Design a protein around this ligand. Structure first.
Ligand code: FUN
Ligand code: FUN
Lengths: 829, 830
């Protein structure tokens, strides 16, 4: 069955080098009891990882054939990328262990057949060379043949285990010079002793052993897609762990009972009565032990690593059994690691490794990953000591396992996704303790490599927390990000005080985001990572086809706006005219705390050639903005496209107009600019005004250059400027005094935005003032980047729309990019 | 200014070990190794000081306290962790310095005639007495600290100057001990390391570290200066510099006077003749007897207070020792409990809220005092200062590494509240310092470092989710606020295409406090799959609208936070209900987080209600349909086996099925047992059965049963029909029964009247909408939630009264009933 397929592949993954190659040395180095405790602790850590993989696998939705795919969809890329990289590296380097064990077994065979190879130590590497160069071909070719031969090759392992357990119980005379005795309880008593260690310790042998009981993840998740892969696989993996554990415990007990720790291949040593001091622990026979305290026995349990091969019955078959085991485990590792690495490369988490996504094979099967794994595997083959290779393999596998356990616990604690484990056996604390014990056992063994590994993990944490990925949650798992944003906004709704932070938000009413790009850039400069600005577009069109064009325009403008990286959300509405859409955006747009409070408008430079009722619409838009207590911002900027950023604070307004330049300075674009504040005041009072204004300026900490308090206000500008203003308002001046009263009343009633004569004499001083400030701006702030000035206003209906726009024309007439502002009454800080 | 922080750092750093253990350190590690230890500890301290200066510069000019400075700069997590670790570290540092005082006193008593007990017990008793006297003084001692600090620094500098003068002054009587006049050969001999008693370089570094610690108290103890932003760095770092200089200005100097092995007796004096002199001692006059064989009385290895012996007129250096010990004791003992009280105040850790209260002449945490004094007096149990030091060294290293890594995390993550505003600061350098601190901790007392790592990991795990989800505790909203901002871009920047349909509903109920049952029920299936926007329209004068508008917003936000709903209360002002609903449905939401369906609690008791209200209510349905929203209504009874009856009768895009599926995936409705009713005429049952089965398999409902009814579209019982006719009787326009003129001017009098022609036209529709009521009554008498496809009609074709009466008849007297209709776009989208 499919569960039988997962179980057979997990049997194949777990049963590698240490089924027979090294387990003799472990059982002889510490003892039967200590070895069994090693098996138990390795089973504990492996089963904690199995529970974590069950928890991630049993998520509601199932997709993807890769292990990295499942770990990345189930939990965010923050841990997913690190787990993928670490496990890919570990699985790539496990090939080294498996093939070097293969080569050592071949060497053991060839020592008896061939008298001596030219370079025995390097013979392991020269054999590993042919093994890897043929294993790459086996991995890239005949995948279906390998899948069909899975069962055939694992039958070899089952036959080998049966062979050895058949051999161990029965006594035999064929292996008489060597250490072969059958289940003698004296052997158990004399081998249970922990005090067998030679240059190695308990945790060292645990570290060397650990590769045997690891690899469950590759069996579970490399397949990814099969019959019922979401729920039924984890039960197969837990049963896999149980079966492998029982096999290892039983085989360890049998080996410890059978073989003596030190056996010399000699016919002698058979003493009729050696009850005196019983130099041999098996004092009854003593066939094979003598003078091995001085000259150690060659064929002993701890001395001979492959004693189980020769001492078991029908020894030719067992060698082929290990051969199949190691080649199978190596090929599984060599096919599993590169695909994980390619999945990680396809994810844009690590652009430095982006070049590895090649897919040279027609049916995927990446080749560059194979080449990289080839290189690293051979480089690790360059070590001929398996007892030395094992600590690194255990190091990286333990790193990956601890990272998996901690990531699963993190998902359980911080519930951002739909992280609902369907396996009741999972518990967050159990996985946490598993991760802690994994980290501790990591520290204990080969501490320097452990510290290097923690440094690497912390470096990946740095790299991910800075460069955030955009592949997986961007496609088919945007729900994770949606829940992220929703939970963060709900958290935001928790805050209860608003007085501390004014925190400007800019609802920008540009016609379209692509239109007036300079305006968008400028407004984004002083509102970026300090507040959200919303590009509001009041769409015009028929009702029937409204929503479709809404959607298409929203998509197009959002793509354009993210291309020219902005922090803006395109919010379109439908309304009969601009004012209604503005009302919609002002009163309803925004959620909880992220609600716009300042209304940004581009100056209507084409008001002269446009219908005034739309300009009247514009001024009514200003007045509606003031009613809801918004801060009005107007930008006039020459669309046809380094010293200072001048400020012209005149009226108290609010704290917003002095706040705008500050945020401009910190963006590194206006960093090399100096704020030259201008504030009006009395001629007798500049010094007092200078100190009084410097107090507030220091409070705003905008590091003012100076405060050129001036008294040129309330002055007739000149003959020509008033002439120009008269020319500006001439097409709309209403000559009631010159014309008949009846016709003047008719013109007023049919059309109300005329500038009545009384309006001119009522507001003559205001017009003089506005022209005065215009000419002062021309004289002083001509060579400045971004002028800031308090926005002139008037009571609703007290001033006609035409004259109000005339004032805004006069003030911002010939200046560089200017930024008129009038905030609300409340102070910003 | 300078005197505010430079003096405090001078008097803090130069604690007890400079005056006793530094000479022993030079004994264990050679002059080169001693200087290497000095520079390494100085690098740690300088990196910590630079990080502290960056913290001070960031955020704002002034803060309530160092705890609050760190809290503003980063937030609750790192600030609370640093505060707790540093408070514990100062609590045990009090123990260190008082043990130093105790050992000096007991050594003096050894010099003195009488002895009370053996050495370890004398330390215990005298240290306890001094700790309780320090209790008496320290509880109220802020008035004289400003005057006392300068005098104590003067005394300490007098002691240091006395040592310097005594270094160049030899004397023949004291020459048997390690007392010589700046001889070069002894300096050469002392250059080489001599590590004895199984003491090693990093172990000596471990003991030494607390001597070069205490800079953080420069800003922690008090600000209150003319320029707190500028005064804190320029002092503290400066202090560190001279500290190291004085340390090295002592270190090599020590090696210039004192021999590594000496004995007091003058008898063992070599005769001036050609002798072997393996040791440099008999170079001058003194053979000794190779004191490595037998433990000698003095010689920088057995007389710790050797610096007291060298300086002429040793009472002054002894008094300097007293001054340094007491000064560092007061500094740390005032620093720690204030931090602990601040941690209680910020409410990051609810388990310790009982310790916030304080009282006295000025409110101070006497509880925090008593607990720190108790635990410190517990730590006095170990009377060996060499044993004491490594634990405090580990805590200081943990605190400094945590501070440096906190600065790095603020700088790297582009923290919204972070701004370096410092001339010479590099986040990479802070990382390097913190990392080296981590390895150094792991090197010394590996189990203790493991314990600290476990504690900090547990605190991090506690403060990641358990605290913030309920209440993070920080008073600076910005560090949260701005964060959410970018996440919204993360939601808007992702191209969702069309495969991102989720239930995002706004519940158009004016008063959230009223009708909480509907809010809880809709939040039940909107808890973790979408946003709930309890929109609220307000009608009133524009003059006072805004103020009361915000008042209502705040009050109802408090109410929704008091209960457990994940809902944003976004209210608007409008002329009437329809305009406000239009405002919400057109502009509410930002990015892709926009409402998609319009929950409307049924207008129960509409009988007494005016007809204009009902007209606007039905026009809300029509507007929602026009603007491509899903309409869901609910008739929960306001008084507020197990099965949820889903009557999928009209293909609405799967919403009618999706909603109960969301209900099931929750704790409350785990026992759901959905029963799916379908409508179909007489035909093969298998067609409908398998079609509905595969449709449910698509959306993963996992039906308990699928059942089909053929009794729809049949004539209902006569009593029910006449009951409905009497229901619609007050609004019925019997135009046929009455005269034509009356009906006419009544119709142009009120457009909502229902002509009998409407009843004739939709007689079969009313028959369906009442027969379905009878069927759901007899079949589904008991049911948790009855989710039913919502009837629809042409806009304006039927008078709103008749449409609303249809909706009322379909839910006449029922358990929780939930009518649903959606846009035909959620085709297996979820
Ligand atoms: N600043 S303006 O008067 O020239 C202006 C101008 C426009 C504009 O029409 O471009 C605009 N958008 C409304 C719109 C209609 C159709 C598409 O967008 C808003 C404004 Cl404030
Ligand atoms: N769900 S409902 O039709 O019965 C309804 C019910 C209410 C309601 O709570 O009365 C409501 N609030 C309007 C309001 C008036 C004053 C303040 O808010 C709106 C609606 Cl749509």
């Amino acid at each position: 069955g499919w569960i039988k397929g997962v179980l057979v592949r997990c049997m194949l993954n777990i049963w590698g080098v240490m089924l027979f190659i090294r387990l003799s040395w472990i059982v002889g180095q510490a003892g039967i009891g200590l070895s069994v405790l090693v098996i138990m602790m390795a089973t504990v850590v492996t089963t904690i990882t199995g529970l974590s993989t069950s928890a991630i696998a049993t998520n509601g939705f199932v997709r993807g054939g890769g292990a990295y795919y499942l770990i990345s969809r189930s939990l965010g890329p923050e841990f997913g990328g690190a787990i993928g990289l670490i496990f890919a590296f570990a699985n790539a380097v496990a090939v080294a262990m498996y093939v070097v064990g293969f080569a050592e077994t071949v060497v053991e065979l060839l020592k008896e057949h061939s008298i001596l190879m030219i370079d025995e130590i390097n013979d392991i590497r020269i054999i590993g060379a042919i093994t890897v160069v043929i294993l790459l071909g086996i991995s890239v070719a005949g995948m279906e043949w390998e899948a069909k031969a899975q069962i055939v090759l694992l039958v070899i392992l089952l036959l080998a285990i049966g062979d050895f357990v058949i051999g161990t119980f029965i006594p035999l005379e064929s292996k008489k010079p060597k250490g072969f005795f059958g289940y003698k309880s004296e052997i158990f008593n004399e081998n249970f002793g922990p005090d067998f260690r030679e240059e190695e310790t308990f945790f060292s042998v645990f570290a060397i052993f650990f590769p045997a009981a690891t690899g469950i993840l590759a069996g579970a998740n490399i397949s990814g897609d099969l019959a019922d892969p979401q729920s039924a696989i984890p039960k197969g993996t837990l049963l896999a762990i149980l079966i492998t554990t029982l096999v290892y415990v039983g085989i360890a007990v049998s080996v410890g009972s059978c073989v003596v720790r030190d056996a010399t291949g000699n016919v002698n040593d058979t003493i009729v009565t050696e009850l005196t001091n019983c130099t041999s622990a098996a004092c009854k026979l003593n066939f094979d032990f003598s003078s091995c305290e001085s000259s150690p026995c060659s064929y002993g349990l701890m001395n001979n690593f492959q004693v189980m091969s020769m001492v078991s019955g029908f020894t030719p078959l067992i060698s082929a059994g290990i051969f199949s085991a190691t080649l199978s485990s190596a090929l599984a590792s060599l096919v599993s690691a590169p695909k994980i690495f390619q999945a990680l490369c396809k994810d844009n988490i690590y652009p430095a490794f982006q070049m590895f996504a090649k897919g040279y094979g027609k049916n995927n099967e990446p080749l560059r990953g194979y080449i990289l794994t080839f290189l690293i595997a051979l480089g690790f083959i360059l070590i001929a000591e398996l007892n030395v290779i094992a600590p690194i393999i255990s190091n990286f596998f333990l790193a990956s396992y601890a990272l998996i356990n901690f990531s699963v616990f993190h998902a359980s604690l911080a519930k951002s996704p739909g992280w609902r484990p369907a396996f009741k056996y999972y518990n967050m604390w159990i996985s946490l303790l598993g991760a802690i014990l994994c980290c501790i056992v990591m520290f204990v063994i080969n501490w320097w490599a452990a510290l290097l590994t923690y440094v690497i993990v912390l470096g990946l944490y740095i790299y991910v927390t800075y460069k955030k990925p955009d592949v997986n949650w961007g496609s088919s798992t945007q729900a994770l990000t949606y829940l992220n944003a929703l939970q963060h906004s709900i958290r935001l709704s928790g805050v209860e005080d608003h007085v501390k932070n004014f925190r400007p938000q800019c609802l920008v009413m540009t016609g379209a985001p692509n239109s007036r790009p300079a305006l968008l850039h400028l407004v984004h400069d002083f509102t970026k990572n300090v507040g959200l600005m919303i590009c509001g577009h009041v769409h015009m069109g028929p009702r029937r086809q409204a929503m479709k064009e809404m959607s298409i325009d929203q998509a197009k403008y959002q793509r354009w706006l993210i291309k020219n990286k902005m922090k803006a959300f395109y919010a379109p509405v439908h309304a009969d005219d601009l004012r209604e859409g503005a009302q919609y955006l002002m009163q309803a747009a925004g959620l909880g705390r992220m609600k716009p409070n300042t209304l940004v408008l581009g100056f209507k430079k084409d008001w002269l050639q446009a219908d005034m009722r739309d300009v009247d619409m514009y001024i009514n838009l200003f007045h509606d903005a003031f009613d809801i207590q918004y801060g009005v911002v107007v930008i006039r900027l020459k669309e046809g496209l380094k010293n200072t950023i001048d400020v012209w604070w005149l009226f108290d307004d609010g704290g917003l107009t002095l706040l705008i330049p500050y945020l401009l300075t910190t963006k590194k674009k206006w960093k090399d600019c100096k704020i030259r504040v201008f504030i009006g005041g009395k001629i007798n009072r500049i010094d007092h005004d200078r100190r009084a204004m410097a107090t507030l300026l220091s409070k705003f900490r905008i590091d003012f250059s100076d405060i050129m308090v001036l008294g040129d206000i309330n002055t007739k500008p000149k003959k020509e400027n008033i002439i120009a203003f008269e020319e500006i308002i001439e097409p709309y001046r209403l000559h009631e005094d010159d014309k008949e009263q009846d016709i003047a009343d008719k013109m007023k009633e049919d059309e109300p935005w005329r500038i009545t004569d009384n309006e001119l004499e009522l507001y003559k001083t205001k017009t003089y003032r506005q022209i005065r400030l215009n000419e002062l701006l021309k004289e002083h702030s001509s060579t400045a980047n971004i002028i800031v000035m308090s926005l002139p206003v008037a009571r609703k209906g007290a001033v006609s729309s035409a004259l109000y726009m005339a004032w805004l024309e006069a003030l911002s007439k010939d200046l560089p990019p200017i930024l008129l502002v009038r905030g609300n009454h409340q102070s910003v800080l």
